[PDB]
Design a protein around this ligand. Sequence first.
Ligand code: GDP
Ligand code: MN
Length: 380
Amino acid sequence: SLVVFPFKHEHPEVLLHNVRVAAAHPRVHEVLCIGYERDQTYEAVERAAPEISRATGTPVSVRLQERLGTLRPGKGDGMNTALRYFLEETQWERIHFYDADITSFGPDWITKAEEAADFGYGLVRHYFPRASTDAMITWMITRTGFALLWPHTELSWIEQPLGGELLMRREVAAMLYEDERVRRRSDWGIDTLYTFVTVAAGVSIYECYIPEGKAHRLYGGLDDLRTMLVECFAAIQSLQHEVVGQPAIHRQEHPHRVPVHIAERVGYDVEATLHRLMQHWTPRQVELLELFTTPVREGLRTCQRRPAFNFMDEMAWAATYHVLLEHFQPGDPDWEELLFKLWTTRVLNYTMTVALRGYDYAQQYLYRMLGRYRYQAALE
Ligand SMILES: Nc1nc2c(ncn2[C@@H]2O[C@H](COP(=O)(O)OP(=O)(O)O)[C@@H](O)[C@H]2O)c(=O)[nH]1
Ligand SMILES: [Mn+2]
């Protein structure tokens, strides 16, 4: 198999460790690191490369991402450049992706995936336990969107649609490299694209569970995620009129109980997030609210004077979602900030009226949210 780690600003030690793990694995026949730019990490890898290759019998290659798409040049270009290398410069039967910044990586990751592929699945997705205030894009944007737009489909049932850890059969990779909507998505929307398209094409999917969780880079306040938020919402938006094919087999490994350290983690700085809600206002944003339902309009307007979020419950979010699908303009600075504030109030609502009632309570809620969304959408 080919194992790929795409990287941007990672520390060298962290990535080289993971490369060492993959290179040591009996089933891995090459590893490719795909860099955003040539930096300290890129060079570090390049010189450790031929030395790891002889100690293991596995070639390791570094390469720059190239401009294959047309949105922000970001992770998409990275993964697609990797697709091209896999498909055009090698004859390997399978391709693995794993985020570069993982600190809990081990060979069972690889093993579990390969075995599932042996079992016959076209695509294998690693999923993990996550803290109840993490994954807020995943739930509030990606899964919610898939549920509101494609209720009868397998799409909202994917556990981790933004997740970067996965394995594909060659033909699946080829199919994806050849799909214009996929190639286009050079920014953060790549994972959403791979998820959507593999499902839509009737690829057979297995989601295997990694109990240890994903130890990666940590994040402080909510606006760390702002670009990602817009790009991820954009991705859904652009798919909104697509149609989905007959589904294949979709099965998911049963999840273990959550590590205590994970159930006990807090995803963001509440104070700072409340502060941020009252910032970066413009008259244009205030006028743009006129597009929204009264409680959302009035809700968000209050945020100019003081933080408000009780209004942003599950129904209000769905209504807000429909307006955004219709009027949101990627590239528009005001729409971008409005989406951010708006998502922000949803997260806070969820944090105080759900996450605070406890981990299990939150998880049960989130799944029931999707359920209710799926059911509402299929009546209209
Ligand atoms: N090649 C490439 N890799 C990227 C880019 N942006 C992010 N990455 C990598 O994609 C993976 C996910 O990035 P990260 O910020 O840690 O994702 P997150 O944990 O979900 O917030 C990591 O391996 C990053 O190094 C990019 O523009 N190009
Ligand atoms: Mn990460």
